[PDB]
Amino acid sequence: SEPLRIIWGTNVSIQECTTNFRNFLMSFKYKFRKILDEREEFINNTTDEELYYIKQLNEMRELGTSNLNLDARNLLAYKQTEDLYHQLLNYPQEVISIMDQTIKDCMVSLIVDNNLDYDLDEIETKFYKVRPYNVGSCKGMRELNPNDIDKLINLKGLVLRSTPVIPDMKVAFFKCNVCDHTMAVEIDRGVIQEPARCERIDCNEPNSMSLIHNRCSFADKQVIKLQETPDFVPDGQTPHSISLCVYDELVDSCRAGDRIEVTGTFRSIPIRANSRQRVLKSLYKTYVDVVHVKKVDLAKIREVAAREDLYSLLARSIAPSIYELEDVKKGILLQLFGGTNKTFRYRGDINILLCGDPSTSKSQILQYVHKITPRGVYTSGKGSSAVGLTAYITRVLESGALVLSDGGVCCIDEFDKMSDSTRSVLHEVMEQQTISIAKAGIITTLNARSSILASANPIGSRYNPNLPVTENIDLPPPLLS
Amino acid sequence: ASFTCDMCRAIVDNVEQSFKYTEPTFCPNPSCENRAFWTLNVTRSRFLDWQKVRIQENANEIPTGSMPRTLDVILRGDSVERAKPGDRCKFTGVEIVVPDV
Amino acid sequence: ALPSIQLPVDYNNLFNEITDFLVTFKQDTLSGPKYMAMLQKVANRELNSVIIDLDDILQYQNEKFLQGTQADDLVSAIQQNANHFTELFCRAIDNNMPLPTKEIDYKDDVLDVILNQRRLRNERMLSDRELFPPNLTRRYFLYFKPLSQNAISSKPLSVRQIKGDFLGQLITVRGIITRVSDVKPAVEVIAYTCDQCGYEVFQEVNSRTFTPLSECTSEECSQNQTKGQLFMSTRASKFSAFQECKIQELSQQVPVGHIPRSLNIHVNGTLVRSLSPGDIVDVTGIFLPAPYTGFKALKAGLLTETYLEAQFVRQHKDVEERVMELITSGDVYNRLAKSIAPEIYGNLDVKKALLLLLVGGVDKRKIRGDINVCLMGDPGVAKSQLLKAICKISPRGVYTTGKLTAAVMKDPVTDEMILEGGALVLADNGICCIDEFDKMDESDRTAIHEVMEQQTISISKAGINTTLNARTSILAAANPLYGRYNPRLSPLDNINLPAALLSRFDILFLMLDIPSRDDDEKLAEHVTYVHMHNKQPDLDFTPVEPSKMREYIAYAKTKRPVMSEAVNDYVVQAYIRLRQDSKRFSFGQATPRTLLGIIRLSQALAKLRLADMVDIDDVEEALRLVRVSKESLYQ
């Protein structure tokens, strides 16, 4: 008699699913997971008697966020959602909406159940979205097949480039031109449910509708070109690329060049052959619609601040591999500390040039000071020259490491191969601590404020100490001074 | 914007162009039934200054290994030619969205 | 408009022949019908690839001839028009589909539930108080395998020999695949759902483009003539793994003075991803044309392209007992040195170094385990022959010229630049042989340091910054700027190489073109002795065995030995001795990097003797090879 609802073509009930997940999230404690992860012999029961998700959902209403990180293996743990786990491997786009509506209903029930004095407006205003991760085995980009269409997968990869934020409509805002009635309609799969007339019976004028673009409510969409990680590639081919679409809060969660394990549904959309025609090509564009992104006190300072032996400790901590040249490592150490930025301006940073043979370990020291520093860039003298190390106009203004490392170390290896333009740039890098260029109508005066560590190469053989070494070094004496 | 009907020389003025150049549809003369072919009145219409400056984030807030994201900023009225390229500068105003014209 | 003609081929009799062949034929020559067992495995979801062999059809019609009756020459009808016969075989399989004999797992199949609801629709609407396309229900991908050793499909053809008369026919091509695109889904049945009537419609795709349906054509939807909007569903759509690749004509098949042509090969179903770039393959496929749609078809007119729908793909390309046989043969070092590159004579120590380049050193959890070797020799002492040979023994290696580097190039199948791998990319986990190391670009002169040091190819082009994988051991060949070698010329001045490169680098070998009468004779009768008889000469020694090295060096890579501490003390003493020699004209001194190189040579000979310890006499012979390199620095 009751007209129940069924997920399309699946014979799966809405009410059974939304009660199973609700009683799951009320009644899942972590000790049942400890049973079914075979971590019974390492139980910590004091973290296990309490409710694992109700505490987290009580933390979300206090912190102000509205996103729940969830792992799907607990669906294998609690029995009533066990088949629901297969739903997460089969029909993601429906059941994910079922979970986030259940989460919002659980905030409503938790506010109204314990009679906590909290306003319902702040609970119902925020949109709650579920973020499932750890659903199954990690899949390869080569092993992806068209059997995975409308399924939920995990991928491991690296970000090549990140587009700027793309607006996507969420509610279309329409206005009548003869009566100024401002109404709102719902966007569904990219087509606007446009009314033919007003909802007002008084005018009911046909064809009077206008779309007000700036008064519509929007959401974020960012496309990321994911690249396969080099550890799992076949030896014959380059790593492939896939489109990776993040939405809302997950936009700009992925930086550039970082390794990420991403969770999302694998979808294929038809690409349109002509801009003004409906004809669709047979080849389909594949993208991963993302539901989750997974990455990859001061008393400890004070206890080594009170020791009198911190000098040799930090001197052997910076380069444990190299035993000799303790003056070199303490000089680099004092470069990491540096002077204070003084203004009324004088530069406080010290500058270190290492003159030595390439076979003697110096690039290891440059790698170590690169890893130690919070800010700092390792670059090669042969790799970048002319105006590459400073700001150069490309495409925008892509600027080098001399301004990107404010207060940090710029470590230049093979410092003998600087071109004359680069010596002239570096002359105001050391003296004025400020680069300045005037190209393509753009004048920029950028604060360098950078500590430089250079390693130079003598020409050919190692050089005798009887006659002075500075004349062997190809660098000009204005840099040496 | 002000336009004239090509049939009966009726005048429609205060047409507002949001993002594309638009012409009136219905002729206000009830005897005339014109729908297209409207001629613009250059003298009667009122114009404003326009400038589109393209900005990017400063080098202090650029993270490791990223191309700078860009944004188009519209200056209208008195604020034209106030901002020269290559300057650290603060714009206060409205974030808008523009369609494909 | 469309006049009709008569052809002497009956499709009904051929369909009867196919549906009798599916239930009749059984192969008892190897030692129930086997194709019925394969269709039973399809019904049990065991396999997704059905391969119809034309040799089986020829043997079936030969068996019919043995019975006395005559067939309708079915295999010739397959070879003439395989495109219609693919659908004919699919309908013959669907007419003879066996019942499943295991668990169905009904929850996974959404199309079964959809067709159950549509049969409920059909029984309810027609109660009165084809429904689905056949490609939607097909879970099997049909392929064809050509006849062999029994005829046009049997004969392999070049790309140039494929003509316009070969369209529609099952052909076979030999070629190298240049570009393989990513695996993309291509549709075959699109499902649309009506939001008002609650019905569906299926639209079949047999073209490169298709148009969607806007309004539903259901009987219930059009009886009340409500204008329900159709919505495309990718869940109930029928998909296939489509991949387009480009095959190139082999250079032996190209006539003199011509440029080789490229052909498009489209693979579908379970035959996807087997194609690899740079692989010489045989492809048997249906040669079909590719027509346009709309304005391109109107402007280009009758001039139409073509492609290949591949049906079968063939690759052109105890071990321990042979390893023990090589052990009991004796002198594995000298045999594997003199067996490699049999066209040269003598030069044993540098040849052993060329072997140990292929052997390699061990890694540590990181320190690189690659050995790198250079030929810093006079012109005319057969550099490029050694480079080509050492490419031919060791697989996953390419000959390159420094006239080199990896760069993503434009004009791909997509508008964006594809990351096409260079010489350093394809030589990863292998050997790259760079000729004319004196004559090489400044960008490569930057790139070699990142190749040796961090083992990656860092390219930043068009806003894309990536690090490709190059775990590559380097052979170098460097002639000096002047051909003659003299003590008045310094070695670093003669070679003009930068000092940082040789500081990173381990072992230079300098062989000189010194005129000695007996040595020139012993080289001269050998050089002309390869010119006397056909192909390789007699080696007047233990003969060559070119197949045997490639598994023995793989085993040598497999052991990875670990050495003891007293041998390390002897290594420390020898390193002290070489620093004392560095106190003692070639300036080139012993470095810690040369000590790591000495270690690499040490476990390289530990790999060759299959040994668990590095021997002491092995270490002193390695330092003797270092002294040989010192003698090369002198001469």
Ligand SMILES: Nc1ncnc2c1ncn2[C@@H]1O[C@H](COP(=O)(O)OP(=O)(O)O)[C@@H](O)[C@H]1O
């Ligand atoms: N056994 C051999 N010993 C020495 N030279 C040989 C032998 N066999 C062939 N050659 C010659 O060596 C030449 C290879 O020249 P190559 O070393 O590549 O010159 P370059 O050093 O200027 O690159 C061939 O032209 C060939 O004539």
Ligand SMILES: [Zn+2]
């Ligand atoms: Zn109105």
Ligand SMILES: [Zn+2]
């Ligand atoms: Zn008018």
Ligand SMILES: [Zn+2]
């Ligand atoms: Zn309908």
